[PDB]
Design a binder for this molecule. Sequence first.
Ligand code: PEV
Ligand code: K
Ligand code: K
Ligand code: K
Lengths: 258, 259
Amino acid sequence: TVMKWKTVLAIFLLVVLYLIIGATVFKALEQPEEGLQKYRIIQEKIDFLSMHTCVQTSELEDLVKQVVLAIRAGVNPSGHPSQESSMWDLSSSFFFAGTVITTIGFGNVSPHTEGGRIFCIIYALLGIPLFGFLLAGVGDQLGTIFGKGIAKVEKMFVKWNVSQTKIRVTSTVLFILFGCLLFVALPALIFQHIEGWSALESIYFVVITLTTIGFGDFVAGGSEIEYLDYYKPIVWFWILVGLAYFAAVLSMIGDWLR
Amino acid sequence: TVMKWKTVLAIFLLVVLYLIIGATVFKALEQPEEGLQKYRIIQEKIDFLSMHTCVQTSELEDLVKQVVLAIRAGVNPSGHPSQESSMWDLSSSFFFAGTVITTIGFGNVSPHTEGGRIFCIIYALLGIPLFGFLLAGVGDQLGTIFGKGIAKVEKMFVKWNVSQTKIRVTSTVLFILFGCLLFVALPALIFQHIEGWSALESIYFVVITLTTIGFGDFVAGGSEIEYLDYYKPIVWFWILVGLAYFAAVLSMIGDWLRV
Ligand SMILES: CCCCCCCCCCCCCCCCCC(=O)O[C@@H](COC(=O)CCCCCCCCCCCCCCC)COP(=O)(O)OCCN
Ligand SMILES: [K+]
Ligand SMILES: [K+]
Ligand SMILES: [K+]
């Protein structure tokens, strides 16, 4: 039941127009913010040069170029590093490898050396099918468990016989809402307590992570706030559970369609 | 085809084991490099302060904090901006929207405004099922044409005393290798010509892009290289072609394996 050649062209045309609409609206939303940021940085640099007689713009440019190059490495220059705080923590390495197999790819931490890149390529290629098999198995198992639970929920007592599929739709909408409430809506509050993030920033981080976009501007562990009680393993297990459960819901929806 | 509970536990233990192994070896590979980086920037800052008596460590730290705040914004400080050129042009945001639906998410181009984050969430949730349906349709279309072509060639070819399984796995291996080399090795060469990146950097970028990891350390568009017109749309079409072909090949191999 493969799609018609002309049909595929219609979906492709729709995707292309979709992307054109998106590009125009991000352009119009987002150019003023970086216009003001460019103005702010150029005015700040001019004030710094004007106020400091001793400093030379060539030396300042060389120092800023070195600092931005350092940012690529991932080490923050603003704070003095103790050097018992290590970016590649066993916990951090576990979280990074988990994101690599999970295909999130935040990007705040990444391999830099030649072997690091080669091992990252090999590790991703070998790991991704394994995680895919795990997710498919957990999704199918959870789907069966959910369907038997659905049978238990449909007691058939005081149903009020309004419609045959009325309670099927009501149960599906209430389970999906409950799952979203616990998986996406509730962790956001934990994130607000732990890191003081805004509501939009936290909900955006959770959607980006569970949708496996992984922009990396917002990451679970950053800026030395001394997280406590095994923050990296619990958040990675959280990501696995959320991705699996929604993979199950999507698979069930597809089964219903078929 | 329900899976067993016992083997799910074993698979999860295997995944956790592999994660622990990877973390232990990554830590040992990667700590010395960043140790040297921290020492290098510490000694450079100390040398700078020693050279300039007038500058005061507090003002310099404040300046560094502002510069690293500006890096988050996405505007480079090293070069003076002409302002005729803008990061959020139609081509860059076309590529960005393509990455968002494609689930690459490089992260060098991210939305900071209140409206931008909300629209990014809505745009992702709307677009991703659409791209998923397009990829499934293209994958199955490629699979069907490949199946008919392989059946036709197999029927014409190998008439006399040859194992069918051997011929089938020879054909699949040769086809996958040819497609993989043409789609991955050749663009690494184009990237080598256009940019300063080494061969390992280019192959790493291509593997990270097609596999949907999207680390963002290396991206096709960067460093004010005055990239030729419509470079972002063509690279995005190449990304679409690579993902569709690889997904189709995986779909075919999986279906045949289960059949
Ligand atoms: C609050 C909202 C909640 C959201 C709901 C949850 C969302 C759940 C998941 C939704 C997003 C989609 C998940 C995608 C899973 C990624 C798995 C994967 O393997 O990546 C892609 C497939 O992987 C590949 O295609 C890799 C291609 C081959 C790799 C080539 C690398 C080098 C090869 C050299 C040798 C080749 C070795 C093997 C050759 C077969 C498939 O994803 P996609 O492209 O379809 O995503 C686009 C639409 N979402
Ligand atoms: K990603
Ligand atoms: K992904
Ligand atoms: K990513």
